[PDB]
C-alpha cells in the first residue's frame, strides 16, 4: 500500500465506503479502511480539490473525529483554497463537515452555503439533489438558500429532468429540513406521476414516507398514494410494511380498505418482523389510534421471541404502545424491564422518561429497572421539557425513590421551568400526586409555587 499515491488512496477509500454503506456493513472493510486512513497525510504533494474532498469524506465517514491529522489537513486545505471547491465537490465537503462540529467546520459550512446560494441558478439535475442532500445532513437555517434550491428544482422538474432516485433524495432532503413548500412537493408528486412505471416498490415507499413526514395537510395526495400503494402490497417487504404503517399513521387520515390489506400482509410476514418493525407498527397504531387486538396479539408474541434484539428506542416505543392500549403481557413486560435495566445507559433524553412513565403508568414495579433508570435519570435532567420533567418526576415518585442525589437535578429542572411546569392542565392530577408523596418538606419553594 506504500506504492499507492494519495490520489489512489482516495479512490480506494471511496470504493471501500461505497461497499461498506450499501453492500453490507462488513467490519473487515471498516477496520482495513480505518487502518489505511490512519497513516495518510496531505503534505508535500499537490492534490486536486476532488482528491482532498474524497479523503476528508471517507475519513469522516469511518468514525474519524475533528482531532485527527488527516481531517485537520483536509479542513485546512478547504479554507485556504475555497474557490477550488467547485459545485462538483461542494456536496462532498458539506457532507464531511456535517457531523464535524467545530469552528473551522462551521466556517466551511457557512462559506459553502453562501457559494451554493450564489450559484443556485446554474446547477443541473445532479448538482441540485447532491447539494440539497448534503445540506440536509448538516443542521442549517439558511432559508434563502433552500428557497433558491427549491426554485431551481421546480424549474428543472418542469421539463422532466429527475429520475425516481432523484425524486426520493430530493423529497427526503427537503422533508429533513422541515421546509414546507406546497408547490415544490406538488411538483415532486407530479414528477412521480409522470415517471409512472419507473417508480418501483423500493422507490415508492420512501417517497410516501418523506411526503408524510413533512405534513402538508393535503388529503388530495394521501388518497392517491394509498391507491397507488394498494396494488404494491403483495410485493412489499416487512420493512416496507412497517414504514407504510408509520407513514399512513403520520398522514392521519383513515383508510380502512388499505389498513386491512396492510394488516393481512403483516400477519403473513409475522416470522420476518424484527424488534424495530414491531415497535414501528405499534407506534403507528398508537398514533393513528386504531385498536386491533388480533394483530396486537401476534405482534406481542413475536416480540417475546426477539427480546434480546430490542434497542432502547424499541423498548421505549413498544412499552409505551402496549401501555396506551391497556394490553397485559406479564412475561413480555418482565423481560423488557430486565433488558432495559441491562442497557440503561443507552437511553436518550426522551426514551428514558418515556420508558419510566410507561412502566409506572401500568401497575408494574421492578427494582432492577427502577433503580437503573432512576440512577440514569441524573444525566438527562438538563435536556428535558417542563412536561417531560413533570412526567419523569411522577414516574420517579411512583417508584418510591428518595435519594437526594437523584431528586435534586429533577427538582432544579422543574424549578427553572416552573411557569410551564404549572401551566399544563392535563398534568394537574399528576401534580397533586407528586406532592402527596413527597410532602411540603421536600423542596419547599416548589410547594410554595404550587400553592399559589
Amino acid at each position: 500500500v506504500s506504492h499507492l499515491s494519495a490520489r489512489n488512496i482516495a479512490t480506494e477509500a471511496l470504493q471501500m465506503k461505497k461497499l461498506h454503506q450499501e453492500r453490507g456493513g462488513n467490519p473487515m472493510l471498516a477496520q482495513q479502511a480505518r487502518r489505511v486512513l490512519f497513516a495518510t497525510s496531505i503534505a508535500g504533494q499537490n492534490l486536486d480539490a476532488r482528491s482532498v474532498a474524497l479523503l476528508l469524506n471517507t475519513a469522516v465517514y469511518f468514525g474519524m473525529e475533528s482531532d485527527a491529522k488527516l481531517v485537520r489537513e483536509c479542513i485546512d486545505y478547504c479554507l485556504k483554497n475555497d474557490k477550488l471547491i467547485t459545485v462538483d465537490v461542494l456536496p462532498i465537503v458539506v457532507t464531511a463537515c456535517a457531523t464535524l462540529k467545530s469552528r473551522d467546520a462551521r466556517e466551511v459550512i457557512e462559506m459553502q452555503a453562501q457559494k451554493a446560494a450564489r450559484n443556485a441558478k446554474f446547477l443541473d439535475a445532479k448538482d441540485v439533489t447532491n447539494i440539497i442532500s448534503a445540506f440536509s445532513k448538516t443542521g442549517i437555517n439558511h432559508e434563502k438558500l433552500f428557497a433558491f434550491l427549491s426554485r431551481r428544482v421546480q424549474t428543472l422538474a418542469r421539463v422532466g429532468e429527475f429520475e425516481a432516485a432523484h425524486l426520493v433524495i430530493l423529497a427526503n432532503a427537503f422533508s429533513r429540513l422541515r421546509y414546507r413548500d406546497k408547490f415544490l412537493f406538488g411538483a415532486i408528486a407530479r414528477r412521480a406521476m409522470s415517471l409512472r412505471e419507473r417508480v418501483t416498490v423500493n422507490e415508492l415507499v420512501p417517497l410516501i414516507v418523506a411526503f408524510s413526514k413533512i405534513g402538508l395537510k393535503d388529503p388530495k395526495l394521501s388518497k392517491r398514494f394509498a391507491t397507488k400503494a394498494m396494488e404494491y402490497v403483495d410485493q412489499m417487504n416487512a420493512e416496507q410494511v412497517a414504514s407504510m404503517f408509520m407513514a399512513f399513521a403520520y398522514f392521519g387520515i383513515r383508510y380502512d380498505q388499505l389498513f386491512g390489506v396492510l394488516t393481512n400482509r403483516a400477519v403473513e410476514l409475522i416470522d420476518e418482523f424484527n424488534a424495530q418493525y414491531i415497535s414501528t407498527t405499534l407506534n403507528a397504531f398508537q398514533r393513528i389510534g386504531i385498536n386491533n387486538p388480533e394483530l396486537f396479539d401476534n405482534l406481542a408474541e413475536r416480540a417475546l421471541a426477539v427480546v434480546q434484539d430490542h434497542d432502547a428506542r424499541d423498548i421505549s416505543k413498544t412499552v409505551t404502545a402496549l401501555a396506551h392500549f391497556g394490553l397485559k403481557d406479564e412475561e413480555l413486560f418482565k423481560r423488557l424491564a430486565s433488558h432495559a435495566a441491562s442497557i440503561a445507559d443507552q437511553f436518550d433524553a426522551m426514551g428514558l422518561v418515556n420508558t419510566a412513565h410507561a412502566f409506572a403508568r401500568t401497575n408494574f414495579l421492578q427494582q432492577d429497572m427502577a433503580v437503573a433508570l432512576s440512577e440514569r435519570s441524573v444525566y438527562v435532567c438538563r435536556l428535558l421539557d417542563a412536561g417531560e420533567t413533570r412526567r419523569l418526576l411522577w414516574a420517579l415518585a411512583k417508584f418510591q425513590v428518595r435519594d437526594p442525589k437523584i431528586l435534586t437535578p429533577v427538582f432544579n429542572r422543574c424549578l427553572a421551568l416552573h411557569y410551564d411546569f404549572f401551566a399544563d392542565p392535563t398534568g394537574s392530577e399528576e401534580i397533586e400526586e407528586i406532592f402527596d408523596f413527597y410532602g411540603p418538606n421536600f423542596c419547599p419553594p416548589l410547594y410554595q409555587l404550587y400553592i399559589s
Binding site: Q21, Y61, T95
Partner: protein, 314 residues
C-alpha cells in the same frame, strides 16, 4: 434502530463501548495460539521483583507509531479547539480552560485512537500478566503527562497505591512509556531501588507539596518521610534515574517510591502511564471508584466496561 446511511461507519460516542481493539497502530491482535512471542525472560521478572521496577529490553513501538501517539497527546491539550470527547475523561488539566506548565490527562483511552489501541498492546500486556502471576489483566486507568519547555515542573516522591486505597488487595502494576527522549534534565523517572518492601509492604506518609520552589528541594523532601533504617538503605542505594528512549517502557511496582524530574530542555516532554490489575481485585466501600463509573458494593469483584480485560492466559 436505523443507522442513517451516512452514519453507518461511525464509532461509538465513547471508545469504551468498542469491544476489543481497533486496528490502527499494529493491526489486529494475534490469534489465541500466537501470544507466546511476546513472553519476557524470567530474569526480567526476577529483576522486577528484586528492584521494584524493570526496563523492558526492547522498545515497544516503532517510531511512526510513537509519532502518531505523540500527535494524540498534542491534540489532547489544544486549549483553542478543545478535544472532542473531552467529557469522556476522568480528569483533565484544562478543566479550568487555562492549563499551565504541566498537562495531565486521565482516561484518554475512551477519547482518542491509538491510546485505546495502546491498552491492548501485546508487548506490555503479556509482561503485565507475567508480573501479576499469570492472571487476567484488566485496565485500571490511563494517564498522560506533558511538561512544557524550560518551565515544566516536577512531580515529587509518591507511591501509586497511596491513591488507590479504595481497592482492597495490592494487585497492580504500572507501565510507563516515554513518547519522547528523556533524561535527568527532562522528565526522567527517579525510583528508589528496593522501596516496595520497606514498611512490610506498607504505605509511607504523604509528602508535603509546596509549589513555586526549586527542583532540588522538591526532590530532597525524601528525608522527611523515611525513618532511620530507611535512611540507611537510602545511604546504601541512593535513588537512581532511568534514561528512556523514544519508545522504551518501564514496569513499576505500586509500592515503589517514584518521582519525575522537571523539564529544562527546549521542547515539551511527554509520557504515558497505564495501570493494570489482576483478576482477584476487590473494592472496600459502596460507590464508584472513578468519576461517573459503575458502582460496586462491599467486596465486589472489579469488572465492567470501564475496566476491560486486555489479556487472558486461557
Amino acid at each position: 434502530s436505523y443507522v442513517l446511511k451516512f452514519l453507518r461507519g461511525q464509532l461509538p460516542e465513547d471508545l469504551k463501548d468498542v469491544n476489543g481493539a481497533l486496528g490502527c497502530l499494529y493491526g489486529t491482535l494475534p490469534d489465541v495460539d500466537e501470544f507466546g512471542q511476546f513472553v519476557i525472560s524470567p530474569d526480567v521478572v526476577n529483576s522486577f521483583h528484586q528492584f521494584g521496577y524493570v526496563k523492558m529490553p526492547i522498545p515497544v513501538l516503532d517510531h511512526q507509531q510513537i509519532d502518531k501517539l505523540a500527535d494524540e497527546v498534542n491534540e489532547l491539550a489544544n486549549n483553542v479547539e478543545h478535544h472532542p470527547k473531552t467529557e469522556r475523561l476522568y480528569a483533565t488539566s484544562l478543566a479550568d480552560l487555562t492549563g499551565g506548565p504541566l498537562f495531565f490527562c486521565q482516561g484518554q483511552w475512551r477519547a482518542a485512537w491509538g491510546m485505546h489501541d495502546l491498552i491492548y498492546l501485546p508487548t506490555i500486556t503479556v509482561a503485565a500478566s507475567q508480573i501479576l502471576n499469570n492472571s487476567l489483566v484488566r485496565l485500571w486507568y490511563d494517564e498522560v503527562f506533558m511538561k512544557a519547555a524550560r518551565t515544566g515542573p516536577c512531580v515529587p516522591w509518591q507511591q501509586n497505591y497511596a491513591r488507590w486505597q479504595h481497592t482492597k488487595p495490592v494487585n497492580h502494576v504500572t507501565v510507563m512509556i516515554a513518547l519522547d527522549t528523556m533524561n535527568k534534565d527532562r522528565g526522567a523517572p527517579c525510583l528508589v531501588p528496593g522501596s516496595h518492601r520497606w514498611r512490610e509492604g506498607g504505605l509511607l506518609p504523604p509528602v508535603s507539596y509546596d509549589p513555586t520552589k526549586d527542583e532540588a528541594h522538591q526532590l530532597n523532601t525524601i528525608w522527611e518521610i523515611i525513618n532511620e533504617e530507611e535512611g540507611e538503605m537510602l545511604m546504601d542505594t541512593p535513588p537512581v534515574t532511568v534514561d528512556l528512549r523514544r519508545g522504551e517502557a518501564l514496569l513499576i511496582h505500586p509500592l515503589t517510591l517514584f518521582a519525575t524530574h522537571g523539564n529544562r530542555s527546549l521542547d515539551a516532554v511527554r509520557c504515558c502511564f497505564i495501570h493494570y490489575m489482576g483478576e482477584k481485585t476487590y473494592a472496600v466501600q459502596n460507590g464508584p471508584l472513578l468519576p461517573h463509573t459503575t458502582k460496586f458494593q462491599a467486596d465486589a469483584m472489579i469488572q465492567g466496561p470501564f475496566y476491560p480485560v486486555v489479556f487472558d492466559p486461557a
